[PDB]
Amino acid sequence: TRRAQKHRLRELKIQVKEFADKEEGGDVKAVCLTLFLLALRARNEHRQADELEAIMQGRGSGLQPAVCLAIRVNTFLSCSQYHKMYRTVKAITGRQIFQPLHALRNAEKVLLPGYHPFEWQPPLKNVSSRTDVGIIDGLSGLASSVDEYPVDTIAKRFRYDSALVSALMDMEEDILEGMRSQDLDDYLNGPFTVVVKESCDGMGDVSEKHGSGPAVPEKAVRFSFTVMRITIEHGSQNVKVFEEPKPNSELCCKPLCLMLADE
Amino acid sequence: HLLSLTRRAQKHRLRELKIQVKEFADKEEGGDVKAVCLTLFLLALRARNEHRQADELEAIMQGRGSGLQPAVCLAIRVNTFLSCSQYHKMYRTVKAITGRQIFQPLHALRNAEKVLLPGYHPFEWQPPLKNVSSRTDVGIIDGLSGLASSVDEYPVDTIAKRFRYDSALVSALMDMEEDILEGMRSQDLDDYLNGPFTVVVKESCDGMGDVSEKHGSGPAVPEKAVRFSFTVMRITIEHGSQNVKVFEEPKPNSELCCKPLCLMLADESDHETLTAILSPLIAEREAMKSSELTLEMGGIPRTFKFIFRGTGYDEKLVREVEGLEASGSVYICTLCDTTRLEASQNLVFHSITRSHAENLQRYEVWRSNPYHESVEELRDRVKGVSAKPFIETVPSIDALHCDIGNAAEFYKIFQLEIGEVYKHPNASKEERKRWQATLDKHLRKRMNLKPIMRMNGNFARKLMTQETVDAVCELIPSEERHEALRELMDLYLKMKPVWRSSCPAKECPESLCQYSFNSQRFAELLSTKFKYRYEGKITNYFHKTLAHVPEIIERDGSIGAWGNQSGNKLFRRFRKMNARQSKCYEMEDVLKHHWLYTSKYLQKFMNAHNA
Ligand SMILES: [Mg+2]
Ligand SMILES: [Mg+2]
Ligand SMILES: [Zn+2]
């Protein structure tokens, strides 16, 4: 019990106390912690040593909902099985480490375009000033009644300014880091210059028809954009505060609209 | 500060302290530096009244904290349909964003899944088990069992992968070890108690329809698949002379308790390949029927017996593997030798007069024909036996077929009673169609029901109501017919709980009683009041519901059910998400995944959140 181990190790306790008062001057905590960690790492059990170091330094047990949403999107996970795994881990570990679908969807709708405000010095004629709208119909109010031109291609689209400001907002951290690295302060103003490239191409067969075989050669198309250069001109010359490492990749192709129409 | 220095600098500064601690350890405890360091650190941590951190440290050292034992992560990965690459990505991402290793690596998961696959734990048998190898570290094997695929032989294109029967049973027992221990502890029994454990096991076999994954290119091949699985139904033990059920399955006819033996790609109607694949399993089963397993699961030797019951066979397969004709025979009852003509006359008075030995005898008589009789008389003397049986089957029925048959009969009864056919000897088909349309419109207007020729269970359940028969009888005069229909509906609703309770011996024994009485009353009412339905037609489901219900109850004591599209979707998901190519390792991988999915250990670790 406690009394037995205390009676058996009081000598070691007072010895470590004297040695810490002589060397560290009343720092038995750090001495014993470092000794325990070194022993556990020499025992070739670095897992428990790292876990103890994390739980003693003050590292959080759970994680932010943003990382959960990120891994859920990058692993192609549904909602039912995700909730199943969440509740299973919460029941096994006792504590809550992951995050339910509520905060996940909250962070999702926060990150989606059409959330944070912005403005334009010109009035931007033929464009509304509303700034809380995201996905809309790609038909743009095209009347498709019985007495008009037949059309059935479902199309969805973002707003160009909305998607643009959303991309700028999610790359704000990277461009601020670049500006801090390129011998520049933080209280800087523009006018920043952003080079945006546009691209669009078809997809081919996107229909997994299995009812009777090959039914229709349904072809789709996507219109997208990509940011690959952000510069600022201060004083005389300029400095490229952001240059895309590999723009010809399938990870920075910000999409605008999707249509189920032939090329 | 000391916490800011690297491990190298801290080691250089505390070498003397470490030497003193280790020499004290080897001089007092005798080379126990680990335990003395743990105790010293725990005391130094508790010296500042840090009981929360002390309890967390104790939980971490014990391993019951944020460890995520490889079994739990394996269950998660196998249930959420997670591949190896995506799981490794998630693991490394969480480890980098958290710092600690909360999940497990891939090799730990491989070890955890190999410790559960069949052919790992040792076992033995009291009999030598002739014609069976004694090797005990084999898992997935080719289901053909030394085929003859040479070019000069009968061609066959199948991929059969199977586990060994004894290996699968030992794996299932090692899986349910904890469950049976908990059960015997809850049943007020000693922790140490040898066998023999009477293990009643259910046997089943059914196809999977279509498992092809061809996106386009037209309907190239049907590619029909088929499986063969078992399910441990119950375990019983005795203390002296009195028996006591020590383990009973909560959901026998479920999907999470389907332990698969073999998986192959062959048509169910393909008889020769099915026989060639299932002969080794039948041989193993008949050799194990009279053996004694010995295991060391609970630290002490435990003996095991087995009782096999092949009740998981549908009608299409029980009319093919048993030797009878598929569908064109006059004989319809799979228990009695009553013809279709005699079944319409004799309703309830029957008995089970079929077994495997008598079927073998009848097939031998058919083959030899020692009496030298004509073909028709020989056929009606062998009671339709034409093929040789090779699997001892125990047929059974479910409530769904019974109720749909009763409703299909009552629908035509309503049509015949609304058409006034008792006064019209010969009617016309168009007049009967007009009767049907009028009845459908009246029902849709009063009861608000949607008629359809395609019959199912929901239609039969919603049609069998007292309000329905009242609404369809209030139209016809001569209220004596109304009273007859009332008595018929009353007898039906009194007989329903017999097969709609799953336990007549405990749920409703009074309903089980007087069954023959009410059945005879119903037969007398049908043969006297409704003396017109005798057209030489009778349904086998209705015959089994009338006659062979009490015998099945006395044999087993339950009916239950069989959720049609249940296994095919799971097989397709396993074959698409987590499976290999080459059509050779694909079946092994899907079988391993299905076995890991049907494990009681992983399921218990999963559904533990309800507590
Ligand atoms: Mg192109
Ligand atoms: Mg079937
Ligand atoms: Zn019968």
Side-chain angles (χ1 to χ4, degrees), chain A residues 8 15 27 47 59 81, chain B residues 1 20 29 80 97 101:
Chain A
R8 293 178 62 179
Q15 180 181 1
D27 196 3
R47 176 177 294 100
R59 187 64 177 272
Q81 35 180 7
Chain B
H1 192 259
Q20 294 178 2
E29 297 289 343
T80 193
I97 200 60
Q101 184 178 4

Side-chain angles (χ1 to χ4, degrees), chain B residues 39-63 65-125 127-190 192-213 215-320:
Chain B
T39 52
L40 200 278
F41 182 58
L42 262 57
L43 264 299
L45 190 144
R46 293 181 176 271
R48 269 64 61 91
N49 299 330
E50 302 176 357
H51 296 275
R52 297 294 191 88
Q53 299 183 3
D55 297 331
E56 293 183 4
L57 207 162
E58 291 179 353
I60 290 300
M61 293 304 302
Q62 182 62 217
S66 62
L68 283 188
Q69 186 73 202
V72 182
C73 75
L74 171 64
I76 289 297
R77 177 181 176 271
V78 78
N79 290 297
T80 193
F81 302 152
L82 233 289
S83 60
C84 293
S85 60
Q86 302 175 356
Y87 180 82
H88 177 59
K89 291 179 61 179
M90 179 178 61
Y91 162 79
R92 64 185 179 183
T93 302
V94 176
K95 182 181 179 60
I97 200 60
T98 316
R100 61 180 60 180
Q101 184 178 4
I102 174 62
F103 282 91
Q104 303 293 342
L106 281 310
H107 56 80
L109 186 138
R110 290 192 296 265
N111 298 332
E113 71 180 353
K114 287 176 57 182
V115 83
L116 299 180
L117 283 177
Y120 184 84
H121 293 79
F123 57 90
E124 41 186 356
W125 299 85
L129 280 192
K130 304 179 62 179
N131 297 329
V132 177
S133 180
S134 63
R135 187 177 295 271
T136 171
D137 57 1
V138 292
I140 46 182
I141 55 180
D142 179 59
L144 305 173
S145 304
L147 212 255
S149 59
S150 300
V151 60
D152 302 333
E153 199 67 21
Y154 183 84
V156 48
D157 303 329
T158 53
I159 299 92
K161 298 302 179 181
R162 67 162 187 172
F163 287 104
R164 203 156 60 97
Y165 213 96
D166 55 356
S167 302
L169 265 55
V170 170
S171 181
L173 263 299
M174 296 306 303
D175 188 77
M176 68 182 305
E177 169 189 349
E178 301 180 4
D179 196 358
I180 187 55
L181 291 182
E182 184 69 21
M184 81 173 192
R185 288 178 180 179
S186 61
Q187 282 289 344
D188 191 8
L189 297 178
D190 301 329
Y192 57 104
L193 221 175
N194 297 122
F197 300 156
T198 301
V199 182
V200 179
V201 177
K202 182 181 180 179
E203 195 66 36
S204 304
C205 179
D206 187 73
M208 293 182 177
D210 187 5
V211 299
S212 60
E213 183 178 2
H215 286 105
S217 301
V221 287
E223 195 179 1
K224 300 183 60 59
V226 58
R227 59 97 179 269
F228 186 85
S229 59
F230 83 102
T231 291
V232 176
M233 177 178 295
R234 72 180 63 177
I235 298 184
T236 314
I237 188 194
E238 80 295 336
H239 50 73
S241 60
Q242 182 67 212
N243 304 108
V244 47
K245 181 179 301 179
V246 70
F247 175 83
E248 178 68 23
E249 282 287 342
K251 299 180 178 299
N253 47 22
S254 179
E255 188 183 3
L256 302 180
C257 61
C258 179
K259 297 290 186 179
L261 286 331
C262 182
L263 251 303
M264 51 295 189
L265 271 61
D267 188 10
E268 186 180 359
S269 300
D270 194 0
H271 190 70
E272 48 274 3
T273 62
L274 180 138
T275 52
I277 293 181
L278 296 186
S279 37
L281 298 177
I282 294 304
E284 293 177 356
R285 198 267 304 272
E286 66 91 7
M288 197 181 303
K289 279 183 178 300
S290 59
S291 193
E292 296 292 334
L293 215 169
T294 300
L295 196 60
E296 199 74 15
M297 52 85 174
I300 52 181
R302 301 295 181 87
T303 54
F304 299 87
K305 301 187 286 82
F306 298 102
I307 298 179
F308 303 93
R309 297 181 61 91
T311 61
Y313 298 148
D314 48 351
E315 183 179 1
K316 190 263 180 181
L317 196 144
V318 81
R319 287 181 174 271
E320 180 180 3

Side-chain angles (χ1 to χ4, degrees), chain A residues 64-120 122-208 210-232 234-239 241-250:
Chain A
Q64 302 295 335
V67 188
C68 300
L69 188 271
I71 62 101
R72 177 258 180 91
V73 170
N74 293 291
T75 198
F76 308 99
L77 228 169
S78 178
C79 296
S80 60
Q81 35 180 7
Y82 179 84
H83 177 54
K84 179 188 303 180
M85 177 182 61
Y86 166 79
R87 64 182 179 181
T88 303
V89 175
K90 200 269 183 60
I92 291 302
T93 60
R95 67 176 62 90
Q96 177 180 352
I97 166 181
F98 281 160
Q99 204 68 209
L101 298 175
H102 310 135
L104 183 140
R105 184 178 294 101
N106 183 22
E108 177 181 14
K109 73 102 182 180
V110 163
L111 194 140
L112 285 179
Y115 185 85
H116 295 89
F118 56 92
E119 54 181 7
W120 304 81
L124 278 190
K125 302 175 58 181
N126 304 328
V127 176
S128 179
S129 62
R130 188 177 299 272
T131 171
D132 59 356
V133 287
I135 43 183
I136 48 181
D137 301 330
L139 294 84
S140 301
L142 179 57
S144 180
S145 301
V146 63
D147 203 3
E148 281 74 15
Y149 191 88
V151 53
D152 56 350
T153 62
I154 292 92
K156 298 301 178 180
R157 76 157 188 172
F158 269 145
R159 295 185 66 257
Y160 207 98
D161 52 354
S162 299
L164 166 136
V165 301
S166 182
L168 264 59
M169 181 154 300
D170 61 59
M171 73 187 310
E172 279 175 10
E173 182 63 29
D174 194 4
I175 66 180
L176 287 178
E177 193 276 339
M179 186 176 61
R180 293 174 56 183
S181 62
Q182 292 290 152
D183 298 328
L184 289 179
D185 306 333
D186 299 331
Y187 52 100
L188 269 301
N189 224 114
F192 297 145
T193 297
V194 179
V195 179
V196 174
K197 58 172 297 181
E198 56 265 16
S199 62
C200 68
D201 184 71
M203 296 180 179
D205 188 10
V206 298
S207 300
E208 353 85 34
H210 296 73
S212 182
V216 281
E218 179 180 359
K219 302 179 61 61
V221 67
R222 57 167 179 90
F223 184 86
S224 59
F225 80 100
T226 298
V227 176
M228 59 179 179
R229 182 177 180 89
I230 293 186
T231 322
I232 172 61
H234 65 82
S236 181
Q237 72 287 350
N238 51 11
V239 44
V241 289
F242 176 84
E243 291 290 342
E244 184 67 26
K246 38 197 301 295
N248 302 330
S249 179
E250 304 292 338

Side-chain angles (χ1 to χ4, degrees), chain B residues 430-433 435-444:
Chain B
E430 296 77 13
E431 195 179 0
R432 297 184 177 182
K433 291 301 180 180
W435 299 341
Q436 171 187 1
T438 303
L439 189 272
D440 293 330
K441 297 309 175 182
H442 176 273
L443 154 135
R444 194 264 303 272

